[PDB]
Amino acid sequence: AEYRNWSKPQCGITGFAPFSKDNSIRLSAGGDIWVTREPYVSCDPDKCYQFALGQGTTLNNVHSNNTVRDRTPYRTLLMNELGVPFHLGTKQVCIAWSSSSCHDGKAWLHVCITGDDKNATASFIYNGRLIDSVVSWSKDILRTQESECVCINGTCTVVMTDGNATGKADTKILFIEEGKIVHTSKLSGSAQHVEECSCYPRYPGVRCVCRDNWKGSNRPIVDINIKDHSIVSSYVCSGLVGDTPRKNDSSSSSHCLNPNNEEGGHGVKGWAFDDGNDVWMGRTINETSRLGYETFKVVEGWSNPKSKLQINRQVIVDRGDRSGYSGIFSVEGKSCINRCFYVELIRGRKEETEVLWTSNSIVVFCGTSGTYGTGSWPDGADLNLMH
Amino acid sequence: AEYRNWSKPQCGITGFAPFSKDNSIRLSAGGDIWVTREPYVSCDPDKCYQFALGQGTTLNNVHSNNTVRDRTPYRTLLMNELGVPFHLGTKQVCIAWSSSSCHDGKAWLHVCITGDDKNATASFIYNGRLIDSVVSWSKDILRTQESECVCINGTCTVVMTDGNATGKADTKILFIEEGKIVHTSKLSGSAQHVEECSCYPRYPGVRCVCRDNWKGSNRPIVDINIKDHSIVSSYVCSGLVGDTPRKNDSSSSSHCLNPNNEEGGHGVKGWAFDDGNDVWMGRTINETSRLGYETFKVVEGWSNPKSKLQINRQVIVDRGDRSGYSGIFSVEGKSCINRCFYVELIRGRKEETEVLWTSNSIVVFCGTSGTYGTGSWPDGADLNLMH
Amino acid sequence: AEYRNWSKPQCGITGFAPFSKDNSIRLSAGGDIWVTREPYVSCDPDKCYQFALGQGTTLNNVHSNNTVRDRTPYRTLLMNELGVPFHLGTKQVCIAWSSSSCHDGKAWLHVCITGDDKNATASFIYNGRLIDSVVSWSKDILRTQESECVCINGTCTVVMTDGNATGKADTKILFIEEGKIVHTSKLSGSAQHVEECSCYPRYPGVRCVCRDNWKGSNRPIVDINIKDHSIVSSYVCSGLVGDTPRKNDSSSSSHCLNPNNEEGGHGVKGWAFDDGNDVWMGRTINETSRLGYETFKVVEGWSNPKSKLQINRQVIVDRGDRSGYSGIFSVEGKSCINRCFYVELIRGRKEETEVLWTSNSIVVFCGTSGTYGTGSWPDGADLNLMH
Amino acid sequence: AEYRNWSKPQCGITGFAPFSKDNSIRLSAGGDIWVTREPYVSCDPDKCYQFALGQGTTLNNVHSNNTVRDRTPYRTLLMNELGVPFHLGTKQVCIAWSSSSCHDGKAWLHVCITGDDKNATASFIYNGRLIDSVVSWSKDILRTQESECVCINGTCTVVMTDGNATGKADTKILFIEEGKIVHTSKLSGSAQHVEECSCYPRYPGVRCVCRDNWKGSNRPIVDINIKDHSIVSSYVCSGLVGDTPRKNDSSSSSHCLNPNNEEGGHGVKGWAFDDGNDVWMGRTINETSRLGYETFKVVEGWSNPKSKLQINRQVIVDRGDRSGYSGIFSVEGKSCINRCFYVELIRGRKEETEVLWTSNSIVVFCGTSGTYGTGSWPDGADLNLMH
Ligand SMILES: *[C@@H]1O[C@H](CO)[C@@H](O[C@@H]2O[C@H](CO)[C@@H](O[C@@H]3O[C@H](CO[C@H]4O[C@H](CO[C@H]5O[C@H](CO)[C@@H](O)[C@H](O)[C@@H]5O)[C@@H](O)[C@H](O[C@H]5O[C@H](CO)[C@@H](O)[C@H](O)[C@@H]5O)[C@@H]4O)[C@@H](O)[C@H](O[C@H]4O[C@H](CO)[C@@H](O)[C@H](O)[C@@H]4O[C@H]4O[C@H](CO)[C@@H](O)[C@H](O)[C@@H]4O[C@H]4O[C@H](CO)[C@@H](O)[C@H](O)[C@@H]4O)[C@@H]3O)[C@H](O)[C@H]2NC(C)=O)[C@H](O)[C@H]1NC(C)=O
Ligand SMILES: *[C@@H]1O[C@H](CO)[C@@H](O[C@@H]2O[C@H](CO)[C@@H](O[C@@H]3O[C@H](CO[C@H]4O[C@H](CO[C@H]5O[C@H](CO)[C@@H](O)[C@H](O)[C@@H]5O)[C@@H](O)[C@H](O[C@H]5O[C@H](CO)[C@@H](O)[C@H](O)[C@@H]5O)[C@@H]4O)[C@@H](O)[C@H](O[C@H]4O[C@H](CO)[C@@H](O)[C@H](O)[C@@H]4O[C@H]4O[C@H](CO)[C@@H](O)[C@H](O)[C@@H]4O[C@H]4O[C@H](CO)[C@@H](O)[C@H](O)[C@@H]4O)[C@@H]3O)[C@H](O)[C@H]2NC(C)=O)[C@H](O)[C@H]1NC(C)=O
């Protein structure tokens, strides 16, 4: 077995085709299913896997009460093959209320953060063995991507943040080899606040589209040179911005090198990627809450901050149904690298009070060069009947 | 590992021997079992697998209400080893309310159709990665075989239909190589309406026996030349016809090249195959509803439209118990290709109103050259006790 | 991989050491567990597997009512690794209300009998594919060993019976190669009635100790020459007889070549094997019902019909707890062949009326050349609490 | 595959990082989970596994009543991959109310003790086959380590004890090769009473830190020469003693070669290991009951009986939550041997009377040479809600 290099061109993409759906919440009304949140997908050279942060409990279970909370000692990283719902046979690969995983061609790396908010620990687990660990450096919720990291040759990059979420924080890029931290780079550039990055290989390096909880609804970009460990950062230029909350499509604006100072203070994990000067992106349909999910291409949106020209829109989750985090993963093919994405479908507290729990299911789409129709693939659970 | 060619003679067949039974519904009264329909079987070079379209729910579950419906966003293709019932550990391999799967000797191909009725998407997934996709062409429920496809050398064929079910529709044969659609052929011949084909390798090509919802109770045949992509079609000549509804065995008639215009408008998935001039077939026992299942050979039934001479009848499901879809799969042996079949055993709405759900179990028989007795292997669940 | 020959000497045996216990019934009071009976054990070159005839239902399930019945269309052969209880993920390898399985070094063979009592079908499944089948020859419950068969070189033997149980029947020995019946030998010798044989390799051939429902409480022996397919039969000489019902140890008698005409009409599956002129055997402790299980060696018991000299007695199940069928399996070691056995622990109807079901758990002991203590390992479920 | 030698240096350790947590009890309030106690961890060259002594029942199950008892015929050794909770699919690898397991690089060895208290049997199972067994020698609860054994070259050592727990007993060290007992050494040295040893490879030999139920709260040490089978024993010198009950840190004393005669009569399984003249150890936080768990290094604590200078303290379980047994396991790396430990988190009777059962979950930490923060990772189940 060989290290991955991702040294192939991105595949031609006219849009996205359905790929997987787990129906986790619907099953949990008649079965023993983990309570989860912050899920993601990542693939080794053979199969794809779905991950999520468990809440140390099943859904039909007294311990699912108050699982809206984000950090407990009971949260672990769950790992299953894509399409296998999180049942009692699921392997808990580490302790974590924030995590990232990736496969370098030979083995899995998991970055797992747990412990106290003001003094958390990141554990680096490679090939099933703990290789390294680092303590929180700003003493304020050390946290990482909640989606897959990227390994090129033998070196994996992962973006971690520590500090005030709605303000100035310390973001670092770690370079990890067989689980060992071999270098640490500070975030550099014009992206001020960066969190929950959705990274993807863009040979010779790594590109990430992130979440800005501070001063903007246009997403930060972080480019990682995996050889000299240099970092450049900016924002997705597209005048159609990708975060939530945001202004409506008439009033919204963006900049290539600065936050847009529109609907700052909040945000959501999301993704985008470049196709020449165009950008492919997803986002919630509703501008203020996490309802619906839509995907489209913005013509010149990767370079033109005034471009509002979208095309190839697809509705993934219709506007009336709940969405959540979303993120990108990459799949190596015969001759090109495809881009896929997952959407977290959050149900429960606080927005829905019929139940006491908070959990999610997922839906997964993959890039295609063929043709496709329309549809909507929501969570589909009836919370009024789950009593 | 090598591509399959199926370049062996069909095995001598005196009838069929019991092979597998899952008891899915009986278990679901005391366990967490998927609600399913439209199941089928297919084998890689080593093991056999059972597939079905899940309904995104278990049986003992509030979400099993109204699962008589055929297309929802929650339906996925379930895949287990043959004999393993669909429990919560079952892998959902794709999103689908219509599907087909086959193994070419190296990896699995899944054809998965989901989305809106008037604008559905077929996803082509090979070796766990999405390779291609195509949109509905007639904007009227793009749909496929609900049983295994067939791969010869590296090329898999699958029959898809789009358009009016009880009338004129557009049926195409797709040629797929490592998940990529390499050619598309239009249905040609005297079979007017063709749906839910049961295909089997008949080297050098592929043969299918299908369902005619339009003008006939004799089953359409489709012959696929896998090299030049040419298509010839006709009907099973046998005066004992294989569809449901149908006329009684005295009044029924058939033609080799035309629908019999008897009990048109309805139908059911089924199968048949040729043994020289004879045809081996199965069908429901009751002429008007899906009750019972019987298998027999019609002497000269593959070529004589007037032949009503059956022999080697076996009762698979006695006349008083519910059956459903059935289909063929092929198993490569040491020196010959065997033919096997599955029978869907449907329970629930609308015909049985004691419950609110609709699901099935299955029973599987394989061709034999030995001897066999008699029996009946129904679903066996007591719906009156499942409250 | 190579065919097994079992061409090693039997290991030195001073008794038996605990090996595995599944606690199936205790678990079923708080989990989804198959209802089973007639279990057995068999090992491929790497691991050991436990088999049983399922009743097409779990225990906590309305369909477990009246599972005292022996033959239904819903019974299947369950197969798990030894120590894994029969949960919903268990593979049902075939349809069967009577079965036998063995591994020849390359793949598994399963002999599976199902269908009507007066017209049953034996299915021969090798390496996951149906290879052969045979119909009942006496039209009276074709039935087989309910324990492992034995393969030497490439040839597996299995003993099947058809006809009146409490009288004259037709017993045949089948020789099976890669699932194909290559020869059939009629039972020959002085063993008149032979059923539910417990066979074990005794190179160059196969030896079986069986159950006589007709005229005796001393167990029949069947020796199978695997090359010329010749059969010799007799009885276990030991004056301490191995069947149930039987006379007390003072009044019991035996013969090497004839049934003892004591407590004829009934019986139970069991086992014994030779150690020079000595016999190692197990049997129920109670003489009339299936209570307790004990193992011992009878000095000269393999050749002396008057020998009542036992030694190395071990209690496996104390006299007050329920036992059932038991049987032998063989495990190839570095330089010798060990002998092990399982005991079925039956609970439920008809003897226990607190519940409506009938099922079993198992306990497994293996031959040892070391030392051992005492104990008792019953089923341990409290049926009064399972309501 | 090759035998393990553990011929690498111990890894540099600044403390311990979180590694795994199973949340077994929280899940059992909404799922079918084994009742267990006395768990441990052990790793083959590829993955780590979690073991425990099952009680032959699940938690939500009438048979979990009175599972505070230590020895029943229903207790079996459960084995799962680390992180997979003990669900109904868990393999019961042997019968045991006391056990030890280890992997020599080629296969697993399990030492399994069951049977009567005054006449128990140890079964030695290697590569899935029973190879040897030995009877109790002092006729008073033959018992072993309840954590992993250690194999160097092809030879595994395991420490077993038989006799009065709160007094003089007979402790032997067994040397096992491919499951066969090849030598037996009597405990020799100044450690009088030795039980439940936590052993770890310290090339060229094996070192164990044990529990003294007799005359001391300082832990016995046993050094095993794996070539000449010689045994030296002593006590952990550290003036901060590792057992429970114990005196407070001001009043406690220790000796290198004698029990401290403080809080004799009781004790708990635990661990420690040497780092030059320093000792790394864990222990309960509360001096008298099994509440809390803390880890630290005692400067010169491996050689100085008066040293009370601790540093690098970490709280594993805060002082108000229940702990239990703990033990060490070793993980071979690229160039060094790491040391990890597990902590049993006991819930239920007798200390907690809201429920009738007694069970545990676990938490696992691994040695690290990086940095870490703080936290507390208790069991987290709410027993008041589990009714
Ligand atoms: C079955 O499924 C398939 C696959 O899913 C479906 O096909 C997909 O359908 C969707 C939905 O329509 C399409 O996405 C939309 O695309 C258009 C852009 O494409 C159109 O316009 C292009 C540019 O045209 C202009 O220039 C050309 C010269 O270059 C000139 O000729 C022309 O007259 C015009 O001036 C055309 O190139 C393009 O034609 C091509 O494609 C056609 C297929 O669509 C085909 O017929 C042609 O042959 C040719 O190949 C095409 O006409 C986007 O406009 C659109 O996004 C708007 O609409 C969505 C709702 O769909 C809405 O959510 C968005 O916000 C956005 O709406 C804003 O913009 C509109 C235009 O500015 C405006 O009308 C709206 O009111 C709204 O304005 C608001 O926002 C803007 C900023 O965005 C702001 O400034 C305003 O103030 C205000 O706030 C979608 O992205 C897919 O491309 C299409 N996919 C494929 C592969 O074909 C199919 O529908 C399904 N079939 C059935 C039966 O269900
Ligand atoms: C911890 O666990 C271990 C391992 O499990 C336990 O050790 C095991 O213990 C069991 C139970 O005792 C033993 O099995 C029994 O074995 C004896 C046979 O062995 C004894 O007798 C041998 C022959 O002695 C005669 O000849 C010699 C000369 O050859 C002469 O010296 C002697 O005086 C006598 O004349 C001896 O060789 C043998 O000694 C050897 O072993 C000893 C250990 O046991 C050891 O001390 C010696 O050093 C030496 O090595 C030994 O004394 C069987 O008799 C016995 O079976 C009877 O008892 C069981 C109940 O245990 C009962 O169910 C059976 O039915 C049977 O009882 C019938 O026969 C008896 C004798 O005829 C009679 O007294 C009974 O009333 C009864 O009679 C009825 O049946 C007969 C037909 O059977 C009928 O004709 C009558 O009319 C009537 O109906 C057991 O098989 C194991 O061998 C032993 N295992 C080992 C490895 O040591 C240990 O007990 C446990 N420890 C603790 C503390 O729990």
Ligand SMILES: *[C@@H]1O[C@H](CO)[C@@H](O[C@@H]2O[C@H](CO)[C@@H](O[C@@H]3O[C@H](CO[C@H]4O[C@H](CO[C@H]5O[C@H](CO)[C@@H](O)[C@H](O)[C@@H]5O)[C@@H](O)[C@H](O[C@H]5O[C@H](CO)[C@@H](O)[C@H](O)[C@@H]5O)[C@@H]4O)[C@@H](O)[C@H](O[C@H]4O[C@H](CO)[C@@H](O)[C@H](O)[C@@H]4O[C@H]4O[C@H](CO)[C@@H](O)[C@H](O)[C@@H]4O[C@H]4O[C@H](CO)[C@@H](O)[C@H](O)[C@@H]4O)[C@@H]3O)[C@H](O)[C@H]2NC(C)=O)[C@H](O)[C@H]1NC(C)=O
């Ligand atoms: C985020 O997480 C990280 C990682 O977990 C946290 O960092 C860890 O924090 C813990 C908790 O403090 C530390 O463990 C404690 O370590 C100290 C020993 O280290 C201190 O003392 C050393 C010796 O100092 C002496 O000598 C030097 C010269 O050699 C001289 O300069 C000095 O003045 C003094 O005389 C120092 O080397 C050491 O400094 C080093 O480390 C510092 C970081 O801590 C750093 O600032 C320095 O730069 C330098 O590198 C340091 O000052 C142990 O004393 C302590 O154990 C005591 O406390 C725990 C509670 O924490 C208690 O449970 C123990 O029982 C014990 O308390 C007894 O002893 C005390 C001293 O004797 C006494 O005050 C207590 O009352 C008590 O006495 C009782 O017991 C004794 C016997 O034990 C008995 O005789 C008495 O009668 C009585 O019964 C802990 O082990 C970790 O080392 C530290 N880890 C790391 C990697 O840094 C961090 O806190 C977290 N951050 C946040 C914001 O949460």
Ligand SMILES: *[C@@H]1O[C@H](CO)[C@@H](O[C@@H]2O[C@H](CO)[C@@H](O)[C@H](O)[C@H]2NC(C)=O)[C@H](O)[C@H]1NC(C)=O
């Ligand atoms: C996190 O950072 C934000 C900066 O965005 C801080 O909020 C600012 O606080 C000052 C002083 O109270 C106000 O004048 C500003 O209006 C706030 N800014 C915004 C954008 O609302 C916040 O206090 C920081 N948190 C901590 C704990 O330091």
Ligand SMILES: *[C@@H]1O[C@H](CO)[C@@H](O[C@@H]2O[C@H](CO)[C@@H](O)[C@H](O)[C@H]2NC(C)=O)[C@H](O)[C@H]1NC(C)=O
């Ligand atoms: C689907 O096709 C059928 C043809 O079989 C159409 O039904 C026919 O409709 C015409 C006009 O209403 C009637 O005169 C015929 O008697 C019908 N034929 C039969 C066999 O019943 C049907 O309308 C078509 N559906 C659509 C949506 O076009």
Ligand SMILES: *[C@@H]1O[C@H](CO)[C@@H](O[C@@H]2O[C@H](CO)[C@@H](O)[C@H](O)[C@H]2NC(C)=O)[C@H](O)[C@H]1NC(C)=O
């Ligand atoms: C085929 O099945 C149908 C039911 O689908 C049977 O028709 C029923 O017959 C009984 C007795 O004649 C009537 O009371 C019912 O009203 C009928 N049911 C329905 C739904 O129409 C029919 O008898 C079966 N045919 C054969 C040959 O067995």
Ligand SMILES: *[C@@H]1O[C@H](CO)[C@@H](O[C@@H]2O[C@H](CO)[C@@H](O)[C@H](O)[C@H]2NC(C)=O)[C@H](O)[C@H]1NC(C)=O
């Ligand atoms: C099965 O065989 C037994 C022979 O063991 C038959 O039972 C005998 O029947 C005759 C005639 O009724 C009686 O005189 C004998 O006493 C019976 N023998 C015994 C040992 O009880 C039995 O009838 C046979 N069953 C069938 C269906 O033929």
Ligand SMILES: *[C@@H]1O[C@H](CO)[C@@H](O[C@@H]2O[C@H](CO)[C@@H](O)[C@H](O)[C@H]2NC(C)=O)[C@H](O)[C@H]1NC(C)=O
């Ligand atoms: C187990 O050993 C202990 C020795 O520690 C025995 O307890 C002692 O018994 C004597 C006589 O009754 C007392 O004088 C001592 O005070 C006891 N010692 C302690 C430390 O409490 C105990 O009896 C032994 N058990 C058996 C069954 O022999």
Ligand SMILES: *[C@@H]1O[C@H](CO)[C@@H](O[C@@H]2O[C@H](CO)[C@@H](O)[C@H](O)[C@H]2NC(C)=O)[C@H](O)[C@H]1NC(C)=O
């Ligand atoms: C160690 O744990 C024990 C309990 O095992 C604690 O003792 C309890 O203390 C409270 C408050 O002092 C008393 O009300 C209880 O009666 C005690 N319980 C028992 C069972 O004795 C003790 O406080 C703990 N010690 C430390 C240092 O935390």
Ligand SMILES: [Ca+2]
């Ligand atoms: Ca934002």
Ligand SMILES: [Ca+2]
């Ligand atoms: Ca029809």
Ligand SMILES: [Ca+2]
């Ligand atoms: Ca008998």
Ligand SMILES: [Ca+2]
């Ligand atoms: Ca002690």
